[PDB]
Amino acid sequence: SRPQVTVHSLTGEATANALPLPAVFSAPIRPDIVHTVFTSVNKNKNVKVNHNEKRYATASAIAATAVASLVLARGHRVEKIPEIPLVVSTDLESIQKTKEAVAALKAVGAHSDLLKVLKSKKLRAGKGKYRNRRWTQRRGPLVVYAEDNGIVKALRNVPGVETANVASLNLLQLAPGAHLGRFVIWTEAAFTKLDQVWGSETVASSKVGYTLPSHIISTSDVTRIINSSEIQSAIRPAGQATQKRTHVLKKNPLKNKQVLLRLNPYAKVFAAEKLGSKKAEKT
Amino acid sequence: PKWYPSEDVAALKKTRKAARPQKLRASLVPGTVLILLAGRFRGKRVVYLKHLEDNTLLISGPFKVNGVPLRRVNARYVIATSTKVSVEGVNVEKFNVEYFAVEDQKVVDKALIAEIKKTPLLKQYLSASFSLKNGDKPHMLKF
Amino acid sequence: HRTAPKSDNVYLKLLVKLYTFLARRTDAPFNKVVLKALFLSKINRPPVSVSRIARALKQEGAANKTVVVVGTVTDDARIFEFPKTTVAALRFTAGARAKIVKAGGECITLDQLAVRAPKGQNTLILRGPRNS
Amino acid sequence: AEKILTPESQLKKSKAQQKTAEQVAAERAARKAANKEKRAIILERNAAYQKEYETAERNIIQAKRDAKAAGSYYVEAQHKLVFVVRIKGINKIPPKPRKVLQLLRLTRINSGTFVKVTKATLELLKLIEPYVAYGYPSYSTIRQLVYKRGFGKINKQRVPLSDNAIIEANLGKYGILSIDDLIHEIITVGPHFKQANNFLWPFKLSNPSGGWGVPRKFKHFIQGGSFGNREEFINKLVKSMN
Amino acid sequence: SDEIVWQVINQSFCSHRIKAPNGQNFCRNEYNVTGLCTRQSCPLANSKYATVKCDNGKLYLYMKTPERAHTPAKLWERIKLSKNYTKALQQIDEHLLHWSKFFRHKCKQRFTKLTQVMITERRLALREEE
Amino acid sequence: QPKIGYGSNKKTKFLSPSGHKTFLVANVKDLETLTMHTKTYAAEIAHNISAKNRVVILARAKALGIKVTNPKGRLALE
RNA sequence: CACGGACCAAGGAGUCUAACGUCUAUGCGAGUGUUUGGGUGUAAAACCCAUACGCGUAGGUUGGGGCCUCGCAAGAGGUGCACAAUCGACCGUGAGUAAGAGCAUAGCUGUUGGGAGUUCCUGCCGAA
RNA sequence: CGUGGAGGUCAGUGACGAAGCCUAGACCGUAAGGUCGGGUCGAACGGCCUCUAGUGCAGAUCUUGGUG
Ligand SMILES: [Mg+2]
Ligand SMILES: [Mg+2]
Ligand SMILES: [Mg+2]
Ligand SMILES: [Mg+2]
Ligand SMILES: [Mg+2]
Ligand SMILES: [Mg+2]
Ligand SMILES: [Mg+2]
Ligand SMILES: [Mg+2]
Ligand SMILES: [Mg+2]
Ligand SMILES: [Mg+2]
Ligand SMILES: [Mg+2]
Ligand SMILES: [Mg+2]
Ligand SMILES: [Mg+2]
Ligand SMILES: [Zn+2]
């Protein structure tokens, strides 16, 4: 929930210019909807899916791209990056050579993820190996560009890296295997254009009759809400949290005098009086 | 505290089991002849002198009569016969449990022999061993 | 009926966790009632329109109460004048949200209502007509 | 260099916990005093009941002796309590007795319960005569059952009656604060007999230690079988089972 | 967002998770103090966190705070525990002052075990030197 | 005849007679996940590991002090 | 034990698809569905526009979960969701109105159907 | 529990021996089975999250070859 992100130059030095976050990143992150839509769409390569649900899943994936913990969870080596969501200067769109783009990626700190994808290449295990699906390798960083100026050609050859236009983002590209939080690199122009493409609090989304989804729960963290300050005033005193065992074993009163007295105090006096063996008058 | 506790130490719950002095069987009384069913002197008749705090009965042969010295014996491994001798002659205070961890035996034996002499044939009884002959059924046998 | 929502929605589960904790740790039955409502299926969560909210507030002494709808609220163009209130519900249609904001009212999630009213003080629960 | 400061939430938590602990200690002291007073009350009630029972028995015996002396017969009041025990398995049971058995809270063989004696209830026993054995319970049998096999229904969870406080928390509304108070409500037909009896879980009884007596059970008591109305002899049976 | 992150990681693919035969789960995360996937355990799940981890002969302490959740490159602050075991525990308690007992206890236990491992690998690799 | 009543106690379930739950291990990194749980768990080297890797795993396991269920397997027979 | 037994190797008793409906989850919401076409496209895809039509819209009192006051509590009340109860008005004697919920997708699944023997292991609920 | 299909993932495993098959061996699970050891095998394949297909027998008409 930062206000803004700092652009980073291709060489690596942090850029003074800063860009406010778009409203997409503050959107619901729903694994279930993304999973269902991902299954339905992956069956096609057919299942009909509601357009609004599809956009919802896309927004959820985009929001997941900012949560570095989820990106680590999927497997990307985002341990060493300047920050998240990772933004790079717009000049990136105008690179013409693969080697220059790779060097810029090394400066960006995505070297580890690319090395992982390179090492992960292995021969296809199944018989699909001879049906045009022979080599399998892990997924690399995604580079988003507002407009192509030759960056697309440079980064085509390098393994693991896929580029997508801002106006055309894909759930399959954003959330491989129905898993949220793919590592993404946004060009500076792309980061700005995301607002126009998806919309902000006071800006139309540019999609006809579309608004970003609302949150059922205003706060993600339930621990903050449950603790709060006023609830604990409203809450009754707590228990032990590990119940004390009462009556693990049954002690028969007839055989154990202590519990017999506990159940009945008058038994003590009656024992002394021996009323049970009392003598009725002979009369 | 030189090592931090690896894993954790589960403290045992407090136990409500207090040890209390033993309640001996009714037959066992000081000056009661006994039969030992195990050990070095199994099947040998001995005299009973006193009950120790650690629940080990104290017994004398006497070593003079039968060669069995002063010794501790467990109560459950012993049969008690109905014949008695008066133990008042022997004082039997000094020797105790910790003491066990010749002259004393002589002092005890003189007093115990003094009472043994009165009853007929008792010395012969204590001298000889006991065993089960064929056709002997313990459950009827009055000891 | 149910012991937990059949839905696999993360946020609904979070709200259910908060409200079951409050119901366990609060004497007020309001938390229990809303907890049981959260489990209900779509058919058992009929929409409560802004129209019904207007009627519920017209009842005497309920003008300043916080209306609660465990579910969704839908707009109703039939009305021109709508009073100001701080409705709380799971979801709000764009029309209903605009009507509430326009009339000086405001819409809150159920967690924000729990922060406001842990014991459900001055609350008014409403349920839509489940004719079919 | 500078000292760290306590978190501003932990301090609030410490304040709240201290106040709660003080409140709990005060409640504990008050509860201890109330427990002492409760034990005194229980002792008084037990003494009163013991004297009442002894006087009632002596009065019945003296009434019999006096009636005989006068030459006039004495007739005892019809017993207002019975104890029923299940004898037969669930299989091979018609619907009409099966539904009745559910009402009497008997769901398994060898289980048993107390039943108030009325014209309505007697016919129910008549319906289930083949499958149950019942009779008038004496005070001693009821006492032994309540002390040994007594179980209380607390939120439908068959809680054992190991302390007077457990019975109090449930039945103080009806003026019953101890196991013996419940035993009195059972041995008599009190104004709250229904509630006290329903509080007791149905008794779970072992098969009789000595045996069932007759070699064959499944005939009626006079015919020479276990099931049926055996009246006072139920006391002999139940004690063997309990 | 920690609760959302944890719930996704729990009911979806925690890539570092390994499902043992018993059914217990182990996060492979090197920074993880307790190698068991739980609410308190995944460094991914929790914003506030700490660990003892060995680098060369040293047994460093790594700190994680919600403040540096962004910029994951500089997220983990590195602190040198003194070779003296008592001083090391004192430093751990000081740094973990006013810090939830779970991480503190687990951190101390991990430091003890790593110290023992360093001692015993010195044992296995004793050489004629010195 | 198998049935649920034969089920073993939870506290004793999935326990070898040595008292250690078996955990599969492929490489050194997976071994290191069992660093402190030496009392609760014992490592078991997978069937598909090569002989060169097994000696490294055994050395690291000895250094960590984690019991290996199947040492001297493919380095000795039976 | 009572009853039967040339021999070895094999092979070994029919197919895709439709209509209506209950329940559950998700998206939107007096709306809802796009794809009937086009643009765009590291190119069946993915992203986006219209273009239409489909199915929707066009009060009295009592009880009442809940919330407010008083009360330590039982209660005293006050107020009243859904819905019911009867009491009626109006529209046109009910499906009534006097403050609507549906559409779409997916899962499971009942019935009708178009040619149309046993059943991996464990557990659970259970007529007659 | 087991069998395949696809997506993702374990910077997984492999001539210091991968997959397949056997194993009256050890461990685990109530069980379907799983893990390891050994044998066999001799070049690549497996674990894990998701969606998608999909668990072993009986018997008859007989047919064919082959043997009387
Ligand atoms: Mg606790
Ligand atoms: Mg128990
Ligand atoms: Mg519907
Ligand atoms: Mg009114
Ligand atoms: Mg507290
Ligand atoms: Mg017998
Ligand atoms: Mg007995
Ligand atoms: Mg093998
Ligand atoms: Mg009305
Ligand atoms: Mg009314
Ligand atoms: Mg695969
Ligand atoms: Mg096999
Ligand atoms: Mg076994
Ligand atoms: Zn994890």
Distance between CA A142 and CA B31 in Å, rounded?
102
Strands D151-152 and E25-27: unpaired
Q: Resolution limit in angstroms? A: 4.0
Q: Has residue E55 been placed in a domain?
A: yes
Geometric angle at alpha carbon B27, from B23 and B32, rounded to 5°: 115
Task: Kindly determine whether the C-beta of residue A168 is less than 7 Å away from any atom of nucleic acid strand G.
Answer: yes
Other Cβ atoms less than 10 A from the Cβ of A101: the count is 24
Q: How far is A67 from chain D (nearest CA, A)?
A: 27
Q: How many domains does chain E have?
A: 1
Q: Are D73 and D203 in contact (CB under 8 A)?
A: no
Q: What CA–CA distance (Å, rounded) separates E96 from E103?
A: 8
Residue E56 structural domain: 1-125
Interface residues of A toward D, Cβ cutoff 8 Å, are: 227, 229, 232, 237, 247, 250-254, 259-260, 262-267, 269-270, 275, 278, 280
Task: Kindly identify the ligand whose nearest atom is closest to the C-alpha of D210.
Answer: 6
Q: At A52, is the secondary structure helix, strand, or coil?
A: helix
Residue E59 located in a structural domain: yes
Contact between A212 and A81 (Cβ < 8 Å): no
Q: How far apart are CA D113 and CA D100, in angstroms?
A: 13
Nearest listed ligand to the Cα of residue A245: 2
Burial of residue A108, with CB atoms counted within 10 A of its CB: 0-12 exposed, 13-18 middle, 19 or more buried: buried
Distance CA B113, CA B124 (A): 12
| Structure determination method | cryo-EM
Chain A environment of E13 (Cβ under 8 Å): 73-74, 177, 179
Query: Nearest residue of E to residue B3 by CA position?
Result: E112
Q: Is A224 exposed, middle or buried (0-12, 13-18, 19+ CB in 10 A)?
A: exposed
Half-sphere exposure for B69 (CA within 13 Å, toward CB): 7
**D207-238 burial code (b ≥16 CB/10 A, e <16):** ebeeebeeeeeeeebeeebbbbbbeeebbbbb
| C-alpha distance from C89 to closest chain E C-alpha (Å) | 21
Q: What spacing in Å lies between the alpha carbon of E6 and ligand 14's midpoint? A: 8
Task: Point out the residue nearest to G44 (C-alpha to C1').
Answer: A45
Q: How far is CA D32 from CA A53, B35, D37, D161, D181, in A?
A: 63, 57, 9, 20, 21
Domain ranges of chain D: 1-242
Q: Which amino acid is at D196?
A: A
| CATH number of the domain where residue E36 is located | 3.30.390.110
Residues of E in contact with A80 (CB under 8 A): 72-73
Write out the E strands in F1-78. 21-25, 41-45
Q: Which nucleotide does the CA of A182 lie closest to, via C1'?
A: H8
Cα–Cα dist A269/D47, whole Å: 9
Provide the token pair at D171.
């039945």
Give the nucleotide at minimum CA-to-C1' distance from A161: G42
Contacts of C10 in chain A (CB under 8 A): 29-32
Eight-state DSSP code of residue D63: H
Q: Which of residues 52-91 of E touch A (CB under 8 A)?
A: 69-73
CB-CB neighbours of C132 under 10 Å: 5
Tokens of D1: 């260099």
Which nucleotides of strand G come closer than 7 angstroms to any CB of the protein? 23-31, 33-35, 40-42, 44-50, 59, 65-68, 78-83, 99-102, 104-106, 121-124, 128
Are the CB atoms for F42 and F21 separated by under 8 Å?
Answer: yes
Residues of E with CB under 8 A from a CB of F: 18, 20-22, 24, 26-28, 30, 35, 109-110, 113-114, 116-117, 120-121, 124
Residue recorded with tokens 């016919």: D123
Q: How many domains does chain F have?
A: 1
Within 8 A of A260 by CB-CB distance, chain D residues are 147
CB of C6 less than 8 A from some CB of A: no
d(CA A112, CA A114): 5
> Which residues of D are less than 8 Å from E97 in CB distance?
4
Q: In this structure, how many other beta carbons lie within 10 angstroms of the beta carbon of residue A196?
A: 16
d(CA D12, CA F30): 43
Find the DSSP H helices in chain B.
63-66, 97-100, 103-118, 122-127
Which residue in chain D has the smallest CA separation from E97? D4
Burial C47-86 (b: 16+ CB within 10 A, else e): bbbbebbbebbeeeeeeebbbbbbbbbbbbeeeeebeebb
Beta bridge partner(s), residue E59: E54
* Beta carbons within 8 Å of F68's beta carbon, 6+ residues apart: F42, F43, F44, F45, F57, F58, F61
Q: Is the CB of F53 under 7 A from strand H?
A: yes
CB neighbourhood size of B48 (10 A) = 23
How far apart, in whole angstroms, are the C-alpha atoms of residue A26 and residue A59? Answer: 9
